Amino acid sequence: SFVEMVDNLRGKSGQGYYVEMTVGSPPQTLNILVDTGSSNFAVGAAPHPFLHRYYQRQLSSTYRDLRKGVYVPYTQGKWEGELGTDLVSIPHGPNVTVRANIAAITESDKFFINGSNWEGILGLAYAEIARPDDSLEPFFDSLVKQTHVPNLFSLQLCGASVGGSMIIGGIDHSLYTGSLWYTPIRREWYYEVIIVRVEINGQDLKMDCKEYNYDKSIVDSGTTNLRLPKKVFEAAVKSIKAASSTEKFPDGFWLGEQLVCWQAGTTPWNIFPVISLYLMGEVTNQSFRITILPQQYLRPVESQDDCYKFAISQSSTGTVMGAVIMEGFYVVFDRARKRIGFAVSACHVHDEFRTAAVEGPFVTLDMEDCGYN
Template sequence: MVFVVLIVIQTILFLNRAICDEFNLSGEAGQAYALEVHVGHPPQKLNVLVDTGSATLAIASYPRKENDIYFHTVSSSSLINSGKQVQAKYSQGNWSGHLASDFISFPSLHLVPEVRSDIALITKSHKFFMNGSGWQGLLGLAYLPVAAWGDNAVVGPWLDFVDKIQKKPMSFLLKLCGTQSQTNATHYGSFKMFGDDNVKPDNNFVFRTPILRKRWYEVGVLSVRLLNYTNTKKDVINNMEKDRNDTHGVSNIDIESCRELNSEKSIVDSGTTSITLPNKIFRQVVDELKGAAQNSNMLILDEFWYRGEAACWPEPQEWSLPWIGIDLLSYEADNQYFTLEIPSQNFMRVVTANNNSGGTGTVSEFCYKLGLEASGKETVLGYTAMEGLQVLFNRSAGWIGWQESDCGSNARVTGPYNASTSLLLVCSLTRPLPDVNVSIKAAQWTLCVISIVAAAVLVYLLAPCVKMFLIKPLPIAQQISLSQAALVEQENA
């Protein structure tokens, strides 16, 4: 009997660990996805937002009104605080603090050892920590050029320290599942890491887009448009049966819109909620969505569509709006692209789910916000465009792979499609740049050479002064005496 009980307990523990390992990300509505991290010795447990839109591991080191959980610096025996000021500014909010280093580990990442890494200790912030947020910092997963910086200080990315101790570059996978049901605003997902030698383009990741510049994860977004089908089963079947190998002319990619989407930058950012678009394209897409809603007899005010306000109903909504198609440049050839097909479940986002049907006397409320925003000039594919998909970031090889997921919405990836000419050229996309590490090393050598030349010139110019200070001066009387003696000897001669 005892043996059976032990087996049952071990099975439960194994299943619990497997589930926790599979889904190690969670978050409340509009707060992205957070991961548990242990910082310092002895380890302090915190939650950090997983952010591909920045490059710094930054954690709160002071108490805040909205959250009294923070990293207690005096409690870590392994903390090294440089005292150097660093800062970072985001599209919403900013913070400042100190550059430090300490031991970092993620209990759910069994293949990644504990490493001593740079961290930013946040001592002051403005509109950075959201009210009620379940996280105390963020884990930046982008490249060094967008890391937090200050006077004579740059916060090195945690991933760079992992690469160094592993002696190989690492890739990571985000599987974002969204909410578990229509009556729940909490979302979940998983974050995994692999050595690049174990990441091979196979049948699972045939859809890859190049990272055009290794700062943020900049990609080529060719178009954002509505697809001519909704969430009905018939539409899904018809779309899955369409020919994915058709040759498309450049006329199917609006050149003006393509250039506008990439005029500043187009990035994949898990730390941002919405799909943000340049003003003109945002208006075009939302106007069509609003028209489709009206044709379906759905009355939703303009404040919802254009101003980011929530719309609420007493019951959860079944959306039958058109899907959004996002065309991305293919890594395989510059005249190829593929399409992310995003269902309305993704961008009609539930932000409040209060089900009071249990006889409490209060009214149920289910509130939604539009997962699209106007951004001015830049394009950002926030996690609204990633939910229901698996996204693999191969940092060293310079590509992002997209795959349909086994959790979340029924988002899809279709293609590849061929254009008749180079999309890099017609859309004026930036060509891939050399690896960041190589560029940084080249810059360091260049600065070294410039410093040596400048020092040589400075020494040459200051040589007379240096000589005067190096040669020990004689007393003034003795100098005069010697001069007079020489004159007398010269006269006598």
């Protein structure tokens, strides 16, 4: 039942959202980072200074060795380990046990985060980007094949402790307001989408829309930031700077290298622009927009100052709609209908004159054009 899954995510501010899972017989409990940017399920399986527990394959009677090594690189770090299968279940998830591929992590480099409270990663994207190749069936594909869990999940990430929900197999309408707006999944590898327009405080960034999606645009729960191609990042930083040029920010602030601080309760939110991303819609010449507030992209780093990191950053690998974007929203990963839905979440943060929004319909032409090939 869906209420069972409401509030099944936890985390620490800026350290990742995780769901509880059990691997093996008898069940070993682990906290697993929810990652829509990858397709491998992997767990700490050897001692590590940042780990408080790990998978113990020797203690599981249902463990099978696949007798294959694996390496998974990401933007932020990488791990290697050994491939196996085992029985997996999600306590605040559907009432099922599946046999799934699990990579036992045996070494890693800048992967685990000290104090984050998670010991593994659930990659929820498609087999096309699984390591070492697309025949290593991802967890969610195993789940759907082996149970009657519908081929859909949703993510409500509640930011600024963190919490939220991963609704497995469905949409929980008590968790958002207004209507869901859907964008096509362009290709089933990452959750790839097409951005057709960008506005900052209502002013069109006016770039060729190909720039927004060079060389892809994805929805990624495992990445903190809004990550933007170089040209777009520069255009956007230039606008955000102009809008806030009432105030003094070291150039390292704009690079996420340094924090800005304000006497508690005096953050000048009004001087930071809203950002609207327009997404390709479901119908011919249809688009919709999602609007994010400064509070999403100025992330509080916890002295009686309020201090913040700038959480829009540059990318050489396309646009990444990270938790910065997703925190405003209820996000439906509707794999069965090849689409991603956005609605404003019931847990949206509160500006007192401005609102995170999902609005449509808009008309926009040759959204063809925006796709990078």
